[PDB]
Design a protein around this ligand. Structure first.
Ligand code: COA
Length: 170
C-alpha cells in the first residue's frame, strides 16, 4: 500500500509533512493518534478547537519513519505580546492591546530525546512557508497558544525577541 503524503521540506535527518482536514482517512487516522500522543504529554483532555476545517497539523518524521515532532497550526486573526509576570513579594502576564496575527501555534512538541536539534524550529519554518499558499509568514505574524516555560524559552529565541505574540490566555 504505497500512498502519497504531503512533504513540505526534506532534511538530512527527516522530513516535515502536513495533514490538512480534507485529506485521505489514512492520513487523518495517523494525524489523530499523534495528536492524542501530544495532548496527553502536554496534559490536555478532549480539546475540541474552533474552525476545525482550517486546522493543519505538521509532523517531523525521522529517517527511521518515526513521528518525533508534531505541531498543530490553526487560523487566528489577532494576538498579544507576552509580558514577564511581576514577582510576588510574599511567596505569566500578557499585553491588553492586540496586534494582527495570521497563524496560531496551538500545540508544539518534540520527542524528548530529540530536542535541541532544531526540529521545533524547522516545523515552525514549515508553517511559515506552507500555512498560506504563496506567502511566507514572519516571526511576528505567528502566535503561540498558552506557551509552557519550555515553549517560552523556544519562542523567545525563534522569534528573536522576548515579547513574542501569544493567544488563548486566562
Ligand atoms: C523542549 C523543546 C525546546 C523541544 O523542541 P526543540 O526541538 O528543542 O526546539 P529548538 O531546538 O528548535 O530550539 C530553538 C532554540 O530556542 C532555545 N531553546 C529551545 N528550547 C530550549 C530549552 N528547553 N531550554 C533553553 N533554551 C531552549 C535554544 O536557543 C534553541 O536553540 P539552541 O539549542 O541552538 O540554543 C520544546 O519545543 C518542546 O517540544 N517541549 C515539550 C512540551 C512543550 O512543547 N511545551 C511548550 C509548548 S509551547
Amino acid at each position: 500500500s504505497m500512498k502519497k503524503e504531503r512533504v513540505i521540506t526534506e532534511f538530512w535527518d527527516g522530513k516535515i509533512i502536513m495533514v490538512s482536514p480534507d485529506d485521505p482517512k489514512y492520513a487523518l487516522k495517523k494525524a489523530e493518534e499523534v495528536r492524542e500522543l501530544v495532548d496527553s504529554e502536554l496534559g490536555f483532555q478532549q480539546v475540541s478547537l474552533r474552525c476545525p476545517s482550517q486546522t493543519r497539523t505538521y509532523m517531523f518524521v525521522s529517517n527511521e519513519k518515526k513521528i518525533v515532532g508534531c505541531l498543530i497550526a490553526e487560523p487566528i486573526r489577532e494576538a498579544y505580546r507576552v509580558l514577564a509576570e511581576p514577582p510576588s513579594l510574599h511567596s505569566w502576564r500578557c499585553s491588553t492591546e492586540p496586534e494582527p496575527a495570521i497563524c496560531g501555534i496551538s500545540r508544539i512538541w518534540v520527542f524528548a530525546l530529540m530536542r535541541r536539534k532544531a526540529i521545533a524550529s524547522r516545523m515552525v519554518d514549515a508553517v511559515r512557508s506552507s500555512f498560506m499558499y504563496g506567502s511566507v509568514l514572519t516571526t511576528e505574524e505567528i502566535a503561540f497558544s498558552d506557551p509552557t516555560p519550555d515553549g517560552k524559552l523556544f519562542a523567545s529565541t525563534y522569534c528573536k525577541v522576548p515579547d513574542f505574540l501569544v493567544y488563548n490566555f486566562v
